[PDB]
Amino acid sequence: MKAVVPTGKIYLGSPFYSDAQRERAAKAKELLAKNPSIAHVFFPFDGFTDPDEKPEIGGIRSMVWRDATYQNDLTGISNATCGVFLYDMDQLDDGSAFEIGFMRAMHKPVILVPFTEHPEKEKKMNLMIAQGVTTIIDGNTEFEKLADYNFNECPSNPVRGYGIY
Amino acid sequence: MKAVVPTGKIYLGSPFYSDAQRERAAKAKELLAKNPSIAHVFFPFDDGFTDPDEKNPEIGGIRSMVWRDATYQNDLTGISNATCGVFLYDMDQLDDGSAFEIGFMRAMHKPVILVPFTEHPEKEKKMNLMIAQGVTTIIDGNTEFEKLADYNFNECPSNPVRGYGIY
Amino acid sequence: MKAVVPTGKIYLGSPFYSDAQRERAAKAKELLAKNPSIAHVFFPFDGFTDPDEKPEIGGIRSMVWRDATYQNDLTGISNATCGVFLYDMDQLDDGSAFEIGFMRAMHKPVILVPFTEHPEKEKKMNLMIAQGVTTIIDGNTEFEKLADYNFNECPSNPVRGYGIY
Amino acid sequence: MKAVVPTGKIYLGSPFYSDAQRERAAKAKELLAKNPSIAHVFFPFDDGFTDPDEKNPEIGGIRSMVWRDATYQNDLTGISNATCGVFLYDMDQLDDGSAFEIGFMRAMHKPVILVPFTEHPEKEKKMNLMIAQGVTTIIDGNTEFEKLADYNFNECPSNPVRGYGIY
Amino acid sequence: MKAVVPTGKIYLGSPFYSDAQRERAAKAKELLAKNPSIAHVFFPFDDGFTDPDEKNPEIGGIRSMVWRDATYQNDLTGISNATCGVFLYDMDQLDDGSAFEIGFMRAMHKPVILVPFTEHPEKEKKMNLMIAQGVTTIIDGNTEFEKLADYNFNECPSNPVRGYGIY
Amino acid sequence: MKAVVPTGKIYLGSPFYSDAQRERAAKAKELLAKNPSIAHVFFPFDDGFTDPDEKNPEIGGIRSMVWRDATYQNDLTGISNATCGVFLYDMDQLDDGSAFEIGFMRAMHKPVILVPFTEHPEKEKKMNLMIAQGVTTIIDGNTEFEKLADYNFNECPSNPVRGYGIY
Ligand SMILES: OC[C@H]1O[C@@H](n2cnc3c(=[Se])[nH]cnc32)[C@H](O)[C@@H]1O
Ligand SMILES: OC[C@H]1O[C@@H](n2cnc3c(=[Se])[nH]cnc32)[C@H](O)[C@@H]1O
Ligand SMILES: OC[C@H]1O[C@@H](n2cnc3c(=[Se])[nH]cnc32)[C@H](O)[C@@H]1O
Ligand SMILES: OC[C@H]1O[C@@H](n2cnc3c(=[Se])[nH]cnc32)[C@H](O)[C@@H]1O
Ligand SMILES: OC[C@H]1O[C@@H](n2cnc3c(=[Se])[nH]cnc32)[C@H](O)[C@@H]1O
Ligand SMILES: OC[C@H]1O[C@@H](n2cnc3c(=[Se])[nH]cnc32)[C@H](O)[C@@H]1O
């Protein structure tokens, strides 16, 4: 069971708007970078340039750019052995959720690293995410577990203690 | 070409509970029921699984793993049987459950019809790239909702998302 | 949710050696034949002839026959919307199990109809089958449920009360 | 066993050049129309998407990315909805689009009926390994075209390719 | 061609508990550990999931749905990560768990190496068609078990099952 | 981001005829060998299965079903093990085997690098829709062949086909 070489190929999915989300991603990268079970980590926001767009994030983008960028992400999922999603429970990212469903449809494991800045609200989760994810590591209290998690086999850890939406 | 018998099997995805959202689903059903190209429609919230071993089933509480598995699988089964997905997509309150299955359906190479709804037309028209590119056909819920009754679900002609800022 | 036309396309998997197994299959067919939610039922033992085999069941078969026959079965699984397996708990059929795993890998629903002529033995099941199957209908006490089951949506019914092997 | 209703959903793949190719396609449709096992038939060249931004569109000419995506997806949607593929395979001028589709369908584990055509029945009979082993059923177009009218698409009985040299 | 680094990721499937079966798995590990083409080996029975909410975990009893889900998924995850499967197949006592994953792996188009074992060589040599055809490479456990240390898992060359009666 | 170890597993598809084709294949291997991102490279024509029952086997001649299955499966196994495909695509004589493989890989959602070659750089630039939209990255073989030595196969950056008429 002991890998002769790292085989964990990570698809790090995550929103990239607010500074918080930006901070989590930069850290998650630092953590995963210490994990000996990882061989490669892909982060989609690290892009394609359409020599025809005379372009802004959030603006109207060319179809060529859209296709190339969306494909770069699907390619990342294809090459990956598992997904790690810095999941924002406050501002739900539909892009991230899409990717989770896509990865599960491909039968790949998905580690959910939820984050919330509202401890007051009863921890609730949509069924699809709750039953779709294979392993959960609380981002607010276990973010560091990512540096040790064995990605060569991705041990399961069902979602529990969450009210199913 | 013209089908000999209805071939469309719809997986109707949509957020629920919310008053407006329930309204949409209800209207979506009526519209689909009028489509001659549809053989079957599956809506996840209709019937449910009852875990006789569940004391006071909290429709938002913890809920047993037995009910979770059985309910989740009923959804994957609907996706499996469907020929296409029709999603009543709320642009104001993004539903990750809906997004999950869109990606799940696209991974299976099945067509997905996105029906966006927004109560704030004055607000920015922006969509996540994965949704904008993942979807194969868009039908504005606020303006073309009625097209669901005429749309040919035997072939699901595509209609790329356009006119939305992308992030 | 009410189908305008039947959409249930059944892949009826089952051993076909003993007379018992042969009896169950003939009955399962009769039952399913009464179900209004079924549009078609495929039973693999209903074959290909290789005009080159100068052949016996259990004997050495030509590769052409093997390929054509195996494919006829995969084609049946491809066309099917769900599988119904007359599962023998006494004499485990690896062919049937293979097909269950194949169908689940394709995310299709699988109805397990177990049979046993040894009520004395503690009901035990292999994990993969127990967690792989989506719906179970006891063959010894609910065989008739197949005539009523709604195959247009295949309601879930997790396996319970079985010792996991 | 006997089907209560037609369940065959055919993806009719085919080059759409030379008068010979479009004529075979024509005949293919006629034959399929008379088959009681067929529920629906999709021919990629029958409809077509129209991109308003695209001016003076021409076949073989530079096309917009939007038109390309929509059209490609329409073909994949057809493959997804199909229960089996029927390819009018031109053995004289190999068509990579059809071959791409045969491979895509086999990856999805769907049956593929190959219907080869040659204007030179006397030249050597050779076939690429992937096509020869990828297809599940072969029906010669030059002498058995007509059985598309009777073939049982509810079950698609296999019939391995034999008699062709392999390269 | 020659790999720059081990690429083989094995999913070692096999029945357990039985004295002889445990022996095989143990020997299989040793043999694989000596293969230069292997980067990783996953054996389902090694480590396990503990459900802190499980009183007296009966290794054959009912067992919680939480443990079942988590354990089953650990297996599907091993199949997902693997590049190929190596199954210590007991021909005397057929293991449906092993058969399930063989089919699951073949549906994913992954290569499967079958390693049959029998304590009754005097008995009929027969194999189920699905196994005989589903498998891509066979290595007799009773006579070539040692080949597991030389086999190139970077390319998994096929070796069709032959010499077995088929039912 | 930077990979700890090479993770690119290439499926090198290519016709294996004319001296030109086998020479490109030769060069392709040389270039790939010098790419630090490549862990392994599979070329379908490098090894080969041998069927003892088969006597006087010849290329293009009638082959045994056992040889056909083994060889076809060896190619599918290669596609399964591969993280991406690289096709030395002959634009002058279309090869259905390569096209079949491109489609099979795209159905599995794997990236496909197309490397087109033409001995007539002046003739019209036209490509079949499925190939043009199916591939994720194009690298001209006639003027950019050499970048196979530097392309980042750990991530395979997309590069849509443009400049080709579509038919
Ligand atoms: O919501 C974030 C997720 O969706 C994808 N994504 C959304 N917008 C993107 C731009 Se602009 N560029 C690259 N990838 C992008 C990512 O996979 C990320 O996981
Ligand atoms: O298949 C996913 C669909 O299932 C619906 N759904 C079914 N039961 C659910 C409970 Se309880 N909680 C949250 N979502 C639930 C989602 O709206 C999604 O469209
Ligand atoms: O074990 C029985 C299962 O395996 C397949 N099968 C095994 N031997 C077969 C012969 Se001979 N002919 C046709 N199908 C056959 C069936 O799919 C059946 O479900
Ligand atoms: O992935 C399927 C493999 O899992 C093993 N397995 C893991 N835990 C199991 C319990 Se508890 N019971 C029965 N089988 C079990 C099977 O041998 C099969 O190879
Ligand atoms: O090359 C033959 C196959 O490929 C597809 N195809 C190639 N170019 C196309 C245009 Se322009 N429009 C729609 N479909 C097209 C067809 O599906 C056909 O089977
Ligand atoms: O036609 C080009 C492609 O198809 C395959 N192929 C066709 N005939 C073959 C014989 Se004979 N042996 C091994 N592979 C073979 C190759 O994978 C190549 O990419």
XYZ file of N, CA, C and O in Angstrom, chain A residues 126 165, chain B residues 12-26 43-45 86-99 101 115 117:
148
model
N -26.550 20.750 1.101
C -27.437 20.194 0.084
C -27.133 18.695 0.003
O -25.979 18.281 0.116
N -30.204 19.736 3.525
C -31.128 20.730 2.994
C -32.324 20.133 2.271
O -32.694 20.690 1.217
N -36.023 16.811 -14.347
C -36.307 18.193 -13.977
C -35.609 18.571 -12.679
O -36.043 18.192 -11.591
N -34.517 19.317 -12.803
C -33.771 19.731 -11.634
C -34.217 21.110 -11.203
O -34.507 21.968 -12.040
N -34.273 21.336 -9.897
C -34.710 22.628 -9.403
C -34.690 22.751 -7.898
O -34.939 21.781 -7.183
N -34.383 23.955 -7.396
C -34.349 24.193 -5.954
C -35.811 24.129 -5.525
O -36.703 24.254 -6.366
N -36.070 23.923 -4.241
C -37.451 23.853 -3.783
C -37.610 24.603 -2.459
O -36.744 25.403 -2.083
N -38.714 24.349 -1.764
C -38.999 25.003 -0.489
C -39.431 26.454 -0.701
O -40.543 26.834 -0.330
N -38.553 27.258 -1.296
C -38.859 28.659 -1.556
C -40.154 28.773 -2.352
O -40.377 28.034 -3.313
N -41.000 29.711 -1.946
C -42.288 29.942 -2.590
C -42.191 30.119 -4.105
O -42.905 29.464 -4.865
N -41.310 31.010 -4.541
C -41.144 31.277 -5.964
C -40.650 30.044 -6.724
O -41.152 29.720 -7.804
N -39.669 29.361 -6.146
C -39.084 28.174 -6.760
C -40.110 27.065 -6.947
O -40.130 26.402 -7.982
N -40.970 26.871 -5.951
C -42.001 25.847 -6.038
C -42.947 26.213 -7.167
O -43.419 25.349 -7.906
N -43.221 27.506 -7.292
C -44.102 28.003 -8.335
C -43.572 27.611 -9.711
O -44.313 27.104 -10.556
N -42.286 27.865 -9.931
C -41.652 27.549 -11.206
C -41.781 26.066 -11.552
O -42.274 25.715 -12.624
N -41.340 25.205 -10.641
C -41.409 23.762 -10.860
C -42.817 23.347 -11.260
O -43.005 22.587 -12.215
N -43.808 23.858 -10.532
C -45.204 23.545 -10.809
C -45.584 23.951 -12.226
O -46.265 23.209 -12.937
N -39.181 14.417 -11.389
C -38.930 15.568 -10.537
C -38.607 14.960 -9.181
O -39.470 14.348 -8.548
N -37.355 15.111 -8.722
C -36.844 14.590 -7.454
C -37.640 14.815 -6.178
O -37.647 13.954 -5.301
N -38.308 15.955 -6.057
C -39.058 16.220 -4.841
C -40.430 15.570 -4.747
O -40.997 15.501 -3.658
N -33.416 19.339 -17.525
C -34.031 20.657 -17.673
C -33.911 21.252 -16.283
O -34.529 20.764 -15.340
N -33.097 22.290 -16.151
C -32.870 22.903 -14.854
C -33.454 24.305 -14.665
O -33.092 25.247 -15.373
N -34.370 24.422 -13.708
C -35.004 25.701 -13.364
C -33.952 26.377 -12.499
O -33.959 26.252 -11.272
N -33.028 27.067 -13.161
C -31.900 27.701 -12.497
C -32.135 29.091 -11.916
O -32.364 30.061 -12.640
N -32.038 29.176 -10.595
C -32.238 30.437 -9.897
C -30.946 31.229 -9.917
O -29.980 30.856 -9.253
N -30.932 32.322 -10.673
C -29.744 33.158 -10.768
C -29.544 34.058 -9.547
O -28.462 34.601 -9.353
N -30.576 34.211 -8.722
C -30.480 35.061 -7.528
C -29.924 34.294 -6.332
O -29.109 34.814 -5.570
N -30.383 33.061 -6.158
C -29.896 32.221 -5.069
C -29.414 30.918 -5.692
O -30.191 29.983 -5.895
N -28.125 30.885 -6.008
C -27.508 29.730 -6.640
C -27.667 28.440 -5.841
O -27.341 28.377 -4.659
N -28.177 27.410 -6.502
C -28.372 26.119 -5.860
C -27.276 25.140 -6.259
O -27.215 24.696 -7.406
N -26.410 24.796 -5.312
C -25.322 23.879 -5.608
C -25.794 22.470 -5.951
O -25.110 21.745 -6.667
N -26.960 22.084 -5.442
C -27.489 20.769 -5.750
C -27.728 20.674 -7.248
O -27.379 19.672 -7.891
N -28.323 21.727 -7.805
C -28.613 21.790 -9.238
C -27.339 21.790 -10.078
O -27.272 21.141 -11.120
N -26.339 22.534 -9.617
C -25.066 22.633 -10.317
C -24.363 21.274 -10.335
O -23.783 20.882 -11.350
N -25.602 18.231 -10.328
C -26.162 17.341 -11.334
C -25.993 17.799 -12.764
O -26.055 16.989 -13.693
N -32.641 26.797 -17.684
C -33.754 27.742 -17.697
C -33.524 28.730 -16.555
O -34.057 28.566 -15.466
N -33.694 31.994 -14.119
C -34.724 32.871 -13.575
C -34.037 33.872 -12.660
O -33.128 33.509 -11.914
